[PDB]
Design a protein around this ligand. Sequence first.
Ligand SMILES: [Mg+2]
Ligand SMILES: [Zn+2]
Ligand SMILES: [Zn+2]
Lengths: 331, 331
Amino acid sequence: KPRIDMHSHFFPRISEQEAAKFDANHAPWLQVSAKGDTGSIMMGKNNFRPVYQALWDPAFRIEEMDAQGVDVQVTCATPVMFGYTWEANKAAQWAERMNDFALEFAAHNPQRIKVLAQVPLQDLDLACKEASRAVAAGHLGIQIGNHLGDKDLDDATLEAFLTHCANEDIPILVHPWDMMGGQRMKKWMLPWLVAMPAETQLAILSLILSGAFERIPKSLKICFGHGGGSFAFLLGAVDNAWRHRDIVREDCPRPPSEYVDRFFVDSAVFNPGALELLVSVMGEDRVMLGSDYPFPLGEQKIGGLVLSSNLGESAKDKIISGNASKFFNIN
Amino acid sequence: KPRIDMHSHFFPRISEQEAAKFDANHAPWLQVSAKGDTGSIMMGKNNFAPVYQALWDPAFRIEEMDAQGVDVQVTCATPVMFGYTWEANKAAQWAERMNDFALEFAAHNPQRIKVLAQVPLQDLDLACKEASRAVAAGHLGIQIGNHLGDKDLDDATLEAFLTHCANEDIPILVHPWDMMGGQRMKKWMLPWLVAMPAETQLAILSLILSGAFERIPKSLKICFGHGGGSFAFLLGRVDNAWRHRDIVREDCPRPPSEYVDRFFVDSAVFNPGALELLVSVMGEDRVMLGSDYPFPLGEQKIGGLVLSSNLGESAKDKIISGNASKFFNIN
Ligand SMILES: [Mg+2]
Ligand SMILES: [Zn+2]
Ligand SMILES: [Zn+2]
């Protein structure tokens, strides 16, 4: 009966000089403060984001998992580490380094800390090879971003990557990143509050409305971060549009709502009413507890929303433990 | 029991020659064949959008307004005719003609057909003037886009406009508009399924998080089309960000969910569970029935979702009739 948190991030102890070998301007590295409890992710000499010790220190993180009652945590790259815009070979070298750091991180306690790998998604062949290598080395799966430039998950290269993972039984976490919006939402974390949930919805609907689920084998295990964004709530509008407009029907032979049996979401929706709607749509078997630890906005009391919701008790057990154990093959 | 549909659209019987004298390539106009059961919207010479014989032709619309149960319908400009792109004075002239066209459309039966006006929002002074003129001419309020051609949608200019309307007791309908994802979302009406609900959420949160509601008189009567987009579902996440991040509180002194009393939304969410959540969040007094008639993706059975819901009887009557009666002053 382990409590499993399946959505968390880490960041490796990369030096500025090491990151500079890759890209002096866009390779992230970690600056740690003099007393070592806090620090910053950096890009070149630029500050990118304030972080604290649990992000990079596995001993310290374990102490916090104990205090939250978390038995097993699955953790993966912070998305700034993805490097999807880099030259493909350099990005492949980088993913392999990051993936080794991840394994070093988990080696502190591989029974309680599990890792997912990143891949150089901009090159299909290298991405597939790294997926297979990383999992063979001990990763439980892969986390990828939800798009590559103007390429959404319906794109043939991404669908091909997902098919490779399906065929090799490699679970996938899709994480929103590099949000759309452009110039008009700089303040008040609007990209996180508006663009992020729409990115995730868009990734899900791209697979659905392109007919990708008809082509990708049922063995694919794929989870979308952050509750599937606004997917669950806007699904009604999607089924209606499918029903009453031909161009929505063109590549998708069944009503969109039925494809919920082909994917998973985590539970980070920050409201009991929202979570009850999510589970209504997805089913209790397809929602997994995820917290976004250890980021500032990443659930204070992990599992707290799920326990306080009016969901049935067996649903609560599935979401907290059952579904993730099966999805990531955690014994 | 009355039945008021406050979300619908019309397009005037403009000719090719009239539109050309504004802009022969950018001023939309209506082409009806010979047998007047079909018709089509043109942008110049090219075809913009095929269209139903109810968008124009009020007599037909009344027949369809009797077919369901719609006693009164509020109708307003198709977004195509906004001209927010155009030069200010030419847009001022254009909104004038469109608004007069509107009254002439409602002239068929002013008791059952009410109109809202459009304004030249790219110029504050001209916008206020047309808002005032159009209302004194019989318009029940104003429809604006959440946006402005291809624009950044939060500033003091439009805050200025909202205050004018509140002090003149002119109701406002905010209507989602030209999408954000640029070169993405080319297929399956993804712009309407993803970007539009996100645009509406963005309009709402930009008001809230800018602290605009702290300086706009409480007399403001404002409503957001299509359920407020994904606002209701994602409000948990927005409250979480406000509570845990300094930059989200910079200009907004109360939690964001506190401001639901400063605005209204329509009920167009096409799903029972989504409607219940929307109602839980906004209150029975702040949701109004709207159908998006006569567009293909409008509600098939106008009011069907609300009526077949498990909401209170008082709730059903406010949503279906009471709230709009008060909002638009309709008897
Ligand atoms: Mg392309
Ligand atoms: Zn995350
Ligand atoms: Zn509309």
